[PDB]
Amino acid sequence: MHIEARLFEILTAFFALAAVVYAVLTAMFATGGVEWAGTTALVLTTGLTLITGTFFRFVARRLDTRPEDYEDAEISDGAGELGFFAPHSWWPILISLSFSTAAVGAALWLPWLIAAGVAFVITSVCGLVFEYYWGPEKH
Amino acid sequence: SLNRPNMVSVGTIVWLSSELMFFAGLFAMYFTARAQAGGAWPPEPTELNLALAVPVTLVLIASSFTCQMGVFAAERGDVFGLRRWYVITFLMGLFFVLGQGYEYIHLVEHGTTIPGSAYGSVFYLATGFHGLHVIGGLVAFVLLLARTKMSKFTPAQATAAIVVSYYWHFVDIVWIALFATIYFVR
Amino acid sequence: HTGVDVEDVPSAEWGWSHMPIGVMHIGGLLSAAFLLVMMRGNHVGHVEDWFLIGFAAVIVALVGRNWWLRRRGWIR
Amino acid sequence: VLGLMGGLLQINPIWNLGPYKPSQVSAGSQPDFYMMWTEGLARIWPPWEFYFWHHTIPAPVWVAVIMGLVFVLLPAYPFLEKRFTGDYAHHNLLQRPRDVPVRTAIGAMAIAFYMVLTLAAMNDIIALKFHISLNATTWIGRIGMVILPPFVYFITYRWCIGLQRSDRSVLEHGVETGIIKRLPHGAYIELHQPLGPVDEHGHPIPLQYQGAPLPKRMNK
Amino acid sequence: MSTALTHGLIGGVPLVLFAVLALIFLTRKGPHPDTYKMSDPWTHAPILWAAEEPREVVIGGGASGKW
Amino acid sequence: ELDLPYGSALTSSGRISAVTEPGELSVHYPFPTMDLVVLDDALKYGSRAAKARFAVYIGPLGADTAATAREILANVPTPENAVLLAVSPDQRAIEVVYGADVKGRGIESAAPLGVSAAAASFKEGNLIDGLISAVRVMSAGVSPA
Amino acid sequence: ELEARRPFPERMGPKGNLIYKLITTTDHKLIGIMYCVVCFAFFLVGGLMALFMRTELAMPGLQFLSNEQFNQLFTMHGTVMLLFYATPIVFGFANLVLPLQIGAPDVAFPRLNALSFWLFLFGALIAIAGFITPGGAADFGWTAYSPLTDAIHSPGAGGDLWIMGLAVGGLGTILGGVNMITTVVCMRAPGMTMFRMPIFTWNILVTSILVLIAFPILTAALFGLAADRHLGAHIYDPANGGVLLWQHLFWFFGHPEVYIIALPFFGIVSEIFPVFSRKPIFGYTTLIYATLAIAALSVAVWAHHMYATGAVLLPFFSFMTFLIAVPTGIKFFNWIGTMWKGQLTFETPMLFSVGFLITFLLGGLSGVLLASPPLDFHVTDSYFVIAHFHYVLFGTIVFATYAGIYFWFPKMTGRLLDERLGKLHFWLTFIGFHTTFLVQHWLGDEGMPRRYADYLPTDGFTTLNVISTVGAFILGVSMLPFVWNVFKSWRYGEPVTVDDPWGYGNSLEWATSCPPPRHNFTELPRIRSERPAFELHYPHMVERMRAEAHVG
Ligand code: HEA
Ligand code: HEA
Ligand SMILES: [Cu+2]
Ligand SMILES: [Cu+2]
C-alpha cells in the first residue's frame, strides 16, 4: 500500500503549505487580521489527509506485497477465500425511515417526534448490527 | 485473496476524518465572534468552574487507557477481560456525561443560555455536539458487548472491538482540543 | 382454483391466487366516475378540479392500455 | 403494563374541560380511536342531499348507510369467499399470508381504507402541527379515500408473489452463506449450503415446498 | 411586443424544428436486415429455435409434406 | 484450435469472448421483431400447456429429409419429450418429428394438421406466419401426461 | 453443429420479480439502476420549474406568477438540479461500473450502499415537500445567504424542511464516498496495480476524497442555522462577523461541490474517446496528475465567489483560480491527441462527447474571464454568470451523462438503444441549448441582474428573453425522443450476445458477459496494461502496442 499513502501525503503537503501561507498573508495585509474561518478549515483539511496517510503508511510498513500491488502477478496468486459479503437485507430502508422521522421532527419543532425518531433509529441500528449474530430460538 | 489490510479498519479511519471536518466547522464558528468581542470577551455573568472541568477530563483520559486494555485483551481471544475493561470504560464515560450535564445545569442557573449571548451560543453548540458523540460511543459500547454475548468469539468480533476502540480515542482527542481551546487559552 | 399457472404464481395450489380482469377494469372505470362526480356542486375554487381530472384521466389511460394490450395479444 | 401506563400517562382530563352546555364549543373533536373512522367519513363525505315533495334526505344518511354496510359485510366474508372460490372442504392447517395473494391484497386494501378514514378524523390537529392547510387536508383525504386502496392492493399482490419466488430460490439452491471464493481461473462463487442431499456433482437436489418457512440466514 | 408574435414563435418554432429533424433522421434505414422472401434462395445459416419452458434419442414417430 | 473470427478469444474457461463492430448487430435473423416475438410467445405458451418442448428448424435437408430431421432432433435439450418442425424452403419440404415420451398424448392426430396449416400458409409466401399457425395447431392438439 | 436459441429474448420478466428484490437488494448493479431512474425523475421536475420560470420571464410584466412564487421557483430549481440529480448520478455511475473495472465481485459495504441510496431518496423527498405548506417552499437563494435565512425574515416552514433534507442527503453522500474509497483500496484483481486502473476509477477515488472534505462542513453550517432558527442562537448575527462567516463556510463547501460533479464525467469521456478512435488514451499518467492537481487546488479558491463584498484577499484567490485553469487545458490537449490520427466513427456516445468538448470549452473560457476581479466587479450577479455556469454544467453533466448512458446501456441490460432516435435527440439538445443560453452573455452585459422576476418595457433586453424562451422550449421538447427510446429499447430492441458490442473496448468490463452475472465474473484475463480487454480480444496487437507507443 505505497501509492495510496503517497497520494494522501502529496495532498497533505499541499494543504499544509496553503494553510500556512493563507494564515500569514491574512495576519498581514488583511482588514481585521487573521480570517479565522478559512484558516481553521484548511488546517483541519490538512489534518484529515494527515490521519489517512499516516494510517496507510503504518499499515504499509508492516506488510508484504499483495498480488494487486505486484506486477508480473498471475490470477492463480489470488485464489482462495475472500471475506463475508452481505446478501439481501431490509434493515437499511428502516434505518432511513427512522432518520427521516427524526429529521422531520427536527424541522417542525416537535420534541415527541424527535424522541420517537431517536428510539426508532436505535432499534433499527440494533437490528442491522445483530442480523448475522442472533442464534436459534432457545425454546 | 486474504488482502491482509483490514477493511472495516480503513472504513472507520476515513469516516473519522470526515467527522474531523465536521468539528472544523464548529471550531470556525467558535473562533469567529471571539475576534469581535472586545476586551473581556467572556461576558461578566460568565465564570468557568475549573474545579469540575479538570476531573472529568482526567476521567476521559483514563477511559482511553481502559479501552486500550480492552483491545489488548481482545487481540488474545478471550471475551471476559474484554467485557470487564469495556464495562469500566462505559462507567467512566457515563461519569463524564453526568459531570458535563451538572456543569450545564449550574451554568444555566445563574447565567449563560443559548439565546442569552453569543458566547453562550458558541459554547453550547461546540460542547453539546461533543456530548452527543460521547453518547453515541456509549451506545456503540453497549451494542458490541451484547454482540459478544450472543455468539462465539471470532476475528470479526475482534475487529469490531478495535474499531470501536479508536472511535473512542478520536472522541477523547477532540475533547482534549476543545478543553484546551476554551478553558486555558480563552 | 379457476386457474393460474405455477410459472406465474408458484404457490397457486395453496390459496386463492386469481381475480378476474373485468372486475379490475370496471372498478377503475367506477373510480374515475366517482372522482369526476366528486366536483358536483362546486364550491368556490378550481385548483382541486385539476387534480380530479388529472387522476381520472390517468386511471382511464391505465385501464385502456391494459385492455388494448390484452386484446392484441401482447399480454397473456 | 396497564398499571404502568395508567399511572404514568394522563388520559381524558375532564376538569380542563367544563360541564356540557349547548352554547359553548372548542376546537376539540375526535372520539376515541375506534370510532374515528365514522368521524372521518362524516368529515370528508361530500354534501349530496335530495329534496322532493315536502321531504328531505340530508347528507349524514350516507355515513349511516356506509356504516351499516360495513357492519353487514364483516360477518359475511367466510360465506362470500367460499361461494367465490368454490372451496367447501374442512381445514385444520393454517395458510401463510404470502400463499394467498388475493386475500392478502384485499385485507391490505381494507386496512388502507381504514387508515385513511382514521387520519381524516384528525384534520385539524394534523393541519396545526404539520403546517398544512385545512382545505388541503380535507381534499387530500377525499382523494386518497378512492385512489390509495387499489394502489396498496396492486403492491401487496406483487409483494406476496416476490416472497414466494424468494422461497422457491432457497428451495432450489441452498442457503446463501455470504462467503466468496476466487477459483484460480478467476471465477467468483458464493458457497451455498444445502438443506438436503446433493448429487454426485455436488450441487444440491431441489426440494418441494410444503407450506413451512425456510431459513434465510446461516446463523439461525 | 406583438403578443401574437411572441406566442406564435415560442409555440411553433420547436414543433417545426422537431418535424424537420424527424423527417431527416427517422426516415433512414436501420441495421435490421430485410425480410426474406420465399422466392429467393435460403442464404442464411441454419436456424434452430426451442421453447426453454419445460425445465428439469428414441424417436416416436414423424410426418412429412411437400407444401 | 478453431478460427476465432477476429475478436473472439478462448478464456481460462471454455467460454468464448467475442466482439462486434460498433455499428453492426449480433443476431441477423431475416424476420421482423414483431414476428419473432409472436413466434416466441406461441412457442412458449404452447409448450407450457402441452408439457413438451416445441422446436423449429429452417436450414436445409439436402438428403433423406426424414433422416436429416431425426438427426437434427438430437440437438434439442430433452429430445425424448419434444416435437420438432423442420422446413426447407429450397426443397419446399416439411417434416415433423416426435419423441419417445411424447407419444399417445394426442400427437398422431396433430402432426398432419400442423403440416397442412404450414403448407397452406406457405402457399402465399409467409414463412414465419406458417410456422406460427402450425405450432399453434399442434400445441392445441397435444395433451399433457 | 447446431445450437438451440430463442426467436427473441424474454421481454419483461415474471410477475413479482422486482418489488421485493428492490426492497431487499444489496447488489451494486441494481442499486445503480435505481440511482439513474430516480435522478432522471428529479431532472424532469427541475426542468418543469425552469420552463415555468422562462415562460414568466418572456413578455415584460407579471402575467401568471407572483414574486414569491418566482423566488420559490428558482430556489427549488437550483436545489433540485444540483443536489438531487448530479451528486447522486455520480454514485449511480460509480455503482454501475467501478467494481467491474477493478475486477471485484462486490463493493466493500453492500448494506451501507443501500443505506446511502435510501437516505438520498428520503432526504430529497423531505426537502421537496415544502410546496404543500401554506407559506410555500424555500424562497431565498440556493446559496441561502446570511441574514435573509433567519426567523425574522423568511419565517415559513419550507426552509426548515430544506435544511433537514439537505442534512439527510449529505449523510448519504458521505457514506457513499467512504464506501467507494474503501472499495478501490481493498477489493482489486490480483494483477491490477494502481497505475493500470482506468481513469474513471481514478476520478471516482479523487471525487470521494473531495466529498469527504466538503460535505461535513456543510452539515455543521446547516445545524448552526437550524439552531439559530429554532433557539435564537446568535451564531450568524451581523453584530458579530456572522454575515461573512456563513459565506466563507458555504463557499468552502460549494466550490468543491462543482468540482465533485465534473471529474467523474471527465473520466467518462476519457473512457469513451479511445474506443471510437481505435487508439490508446493519450497521456495516461499526465491525465492522472492533472486530476490530482485539480483536486488539490479546488479547496483553495473558494472566495472567488466573494469578490464584490470588499472583505476577501483578492490577489491570493485570483492567482489560485488562474492556476487551476491550467490542468483543465492539459486535459483538453490530451483528449485532442487521443482522437488525433485515428479511425473516427461517430455513434451516439462519440457525438455526445464531441458536443461536451465544444460546450465545455466555451464555458471554461467564460469562466477564466470571470476569474478577474475587475471584470467580475461588473459582470457579477448578472446573466453572464448564469450563462457561464450553465455552459459548464450542461456540457459536463448532461452531455457526459447521455454519452455514458448510451455507452453502458448494453452492458447493464443486454439490449441496444436505437441510433436514429439518439441522433435526433442529440441534435435537438444541441440546437436548444445554444439557442437558450448564448444571448444571456449580452443580456447580462447590459444591466440585467439574476433572480429578477420582472422588468420594464423601457429597459432593453426584451427580444433576447423571447429568444431564450424559444430555446428553453426546444430543450424541453428534446426529452421525448430519449424517454421513448429508453422505454422501447428496454423491452424490445436489438439483443447483444457478445461481449463488447462497441468493438475495440478496454477496462476489463468488456471482458465479461454483456449482462454480467451475479459476482460479475466467471474468469479473468492476464492484466499487463490498462487495456486488458483489448489485449485479450486482439492478441496479434500486443507487440505493435508495446513497440510504437512512445513515438509521439
Ligand atoms: C461543473 C461546474 C463548474 C465548472 C467546471 C466551473 C469552472 C470554473 N469556474 Fe465556475 N461556477 C459554477 C460552476 C462551475 N464552474 C457555478 C454553479 C457558479 C455560481 C453558482 C451560484 O452562484 O449560484 C460558478 C461561479 C464562478 C465564479 C464567480 C462568478 C460570480 O458569482 O460572480 C468564478 C469567478 O472566479 C468562476 C470561475 C471558474 C473557473 C476559473 C473555472 C475553471 O475550472 C475553468 C477553466 C477551464 C477551461 C476550459 C480553460 C480552458 C483551457 C485551455 C484550453 C487553455 C486556455 C487558455 C487560457 C484562456 C488561459 N465560477
Ligand atoms: C445541473 C444544474 C442545472 C440544470 C441541468 C439546469 C437546467 C436549465 N436551467 Fe437552470 N439553474 C441552475 C442549475 C441548472 N439548471 C442553478 C444552480 C441556478 C441558479 C439558482 C439560483 O439562482 O439560486 C439556475 C438558474 C436558472 C435561471 C435563472 C433563474 C433566475 O435567476 O432568475 C434560468 C432562466 O433562464 C435557468 C434555465 C434553465 C433551462 C432552460 C434549463 C434546461 O436545461 C432544462 C429544461 C429541461 C426540461 C424542460 C425538462 C423537461 C420537462 C418536462 C418534459 C416536464 C415533465 C414534467 C414532469 C415529468 C414532472 N436556470
Ligand atoms: Cu466557483
Ligand atoms: Cu453575490
Residue numbers in the entry:
A (entry chain H): 1 to 139
B (entry chain G): 18 to 203
C (entry chain D): 25 to 100
D (entry chain N): 276 to 495
E (entry chain I): 1 to 56, 69 to 79
F (entry chain J): 13 to 157
G (entry chain F): 10 to 561
Give verbatim lines from the article.
We confirmed this complex to be active with a turnover number of 23.3 ± 2.4 e-s–1 (mean ± SD, n = 4), in agreement with the previous study that shows M. tuberculosis CIII can functionally complement native M. smegmatis CIII and maintain the growth of M. smegmatis. The structure of this hybrid supercomplex was determined by cryo-EM to an overall resolution of 2.68 Å, allowing that the components to be clearly assigned in the density map. The hybrid supercomplex including the M. tuberculosis CIII dimer forms a pseudo twofold symmetrical compact rod, but with a slight curvature in the membrane plane, as previously observed in the M. smegmatis CIII2CIV2 supercomplex. The hybrid supercomplex is structurally similar to the supercomplex isolated from M. smegmatis, except that subunits LpqE and Unk (probably MSMEG_0987) were not observed here. In the present structure, two canonical quinone-binding sites are identified: (i) the quinol oxidation site (QP site) and (ii) the quinone reduction site (QN site). The QP site is at the center of an inverted triangle structure surrounded by helices. One MK molecule was identified at this site with its naphthoquinone ring surrounded by hydrophobic residues, QcrBPhe158, QcrBTyr161, QcrBLeu180, QcrBIle183, QcrBMet310, and QcrBMet342. The edge-to-edge distance from MK to heme bL is 15 Å, exceeding the 14 Å limit for efficient physiological electron transfer. Thus, we speculate that what is observed here is the oxidized product as it leaves the QP site. In addition, the QN site is formed largely by QcrBTMH1, QcrBTMH4, QcrBTMH5 and one loop region of QcrB. The head group of MK is bound in this pocket interacting with QcrBPhe39, QcrBGlu49, QcrBLeu225, QcrBLeu232, QcrBTrp236, and QcrBPhe262, and its long hydrophobic tail extends along QcrBTMH1 towards the periplasmic side.
